[PDB]
Design a protein that fits this description.
alpha+beta, 9 helices, Glutathione S-transferase Yfyf (Class Pi), Chain A, domain 2, 4-stranded mixed β-sheet, binds glutathione sulfonic acid, about 55% helix, Glutaredoxin, 4 strands, steroid Delta-isomerase activity (chains A, B), peroxidase (chains A, B), homodimer
Chain lengths: ~220, ~220
């Protein structure tokens, strides 16, 4: 089989979603954490990062970089990419909006302190008046347990991850989304997911303060 | 067949790549240009933008939003997405780095004037010391006319588009990349592409000044 090698900083960043996807597929993986600028330079020196950047996953003989390229690949091979040409349109259109808000939130602990409060208000607004209603809409439309195809797919995992971050951001934002709430429980309960959520796994912690400082050396 | 409907501002923005892809596939499309905040509000009011945003293409009965979702869909249906599960890894990993630099350049005519010169220097550096060598590497590795699978795919089109923007940015940056140069000629010469490049097509003009101002009302 071969255990994929993920290269990244000891942080969620962009690799987090990849970690989540792999674990959900029940595929064990090895990681090499970039801990020093040296590590990174050495990494680049090897000529294995197509654009001198990470994420980069060694898998099936490829040195696949680019978050979406990696995820996309993993999704197909582990049948987490739906049944056909239209389901993926849905999955695709559902994952990107999920990526959007994710970044939106990320920014919060990265922006000029002078403007945090305002960005946060926007993020909350967006979260509850744009994103959540959208996904909730999707669930309410078919009443089935999975977002697409009534079969587990990558967005289900992606949605879970986002919901977990929204819960870390402002938990009250999720209290008016029943099906989403229920969804979170369901997906979280999946054996693979549960294991990953259990402490002692490759899931990385949220950043800020402690992590903000460590970023101020390499990330 | 049905002619897809693309909703967007009268600008390249994020839809440009979609326009390029469609034309390359020889698929005619209709567009409804967002010309007034009203237009946009009305557009949103209809409840057809999953996240209240555009790009959004009506196609095959879907109101598909999300740039990458749309492109991805178009690529598969018009067989511009390679032969298999590994070629797309390549295509994927090649399109995103192409999207990266694109945005990088975009920023130039959007950043605080105080810092343009510096960002531009970085963009030029990146262009010629990171991106171009990468794609050039890909071409030099197999000597065939297409980047992947020796068959025309979406990245070929995406690469062309980027090269055209790099040519608009700083043409001298392309003079040390033979195969890229040749590639540009080849792809540009493709009947579908040529037509699109010919004036009087749906290809949008670059922004700034004239366009900067018009953005200051809606975009
Ligand atoms: N589009 C890339 C972005 C990757 C990226 O920006 N990588 C950064 C690090 S981080 O922002 O993700 O932390 C990097 O490797 N930068 C190092 C370099 O470019 O030399 C992706 O999604 O994979
Ligand atoms: N991730 C989306 C981004 C789309 C986006 O940001 N759309 C903006 C307009 S633009 O930045 O592309 O010009 C929008 O519709 N904003 C209106 C709104 O959000 O209400 C995509 O790639 O499709």
């Amino acid at each position: 089989s071969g255990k994929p090698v993920l290269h990244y900083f000891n942080a969620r960043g962009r690799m987090e979603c990849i970690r989540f996807l792999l674990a959900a597929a029940g595929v064990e993986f090895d990681e090499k954490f970039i801990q020093s600028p040296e590590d990174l330079e050495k990494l680049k020196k090897d000529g294995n990062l197509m654009f001198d950047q990470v994420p980069m996953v060694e898998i099936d003989g490829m040195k696949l970089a680019q978050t979406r390229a990696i995820l996309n690949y993993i999704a197909t091979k582990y049948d987490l990419y739906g049944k056909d040409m239209k389901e993926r349109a849905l999955i695709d259109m559902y994952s990107e909006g999920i990526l959007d808000l994710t970044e939106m939130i990320m920014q919060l602990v990265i922006c000029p302190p002078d403007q945090k409060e305002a960005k946060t208000a926007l993020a909350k607004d967006r979260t509850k008046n744009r994103y959540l209603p959208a996904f909730e809409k999707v669930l309410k439309s078919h009443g089935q347990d999975y977002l697409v195809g009534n079969k587990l797919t990558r967005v289900d995992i992606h949605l879970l991850e986002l919901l977990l971050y929204v819960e870390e951001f402002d938990a009250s934002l999720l209290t008016s989304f029943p099906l989403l709430k229920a969804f979170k429980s369901r997906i979280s309960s999946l054996p693979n997911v549960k294991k990953f959520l259990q402490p002692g796994s490759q899931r990385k912690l949220p950043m800020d303060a402690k992590q903000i400082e460590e970023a101020r050396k390499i990330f």
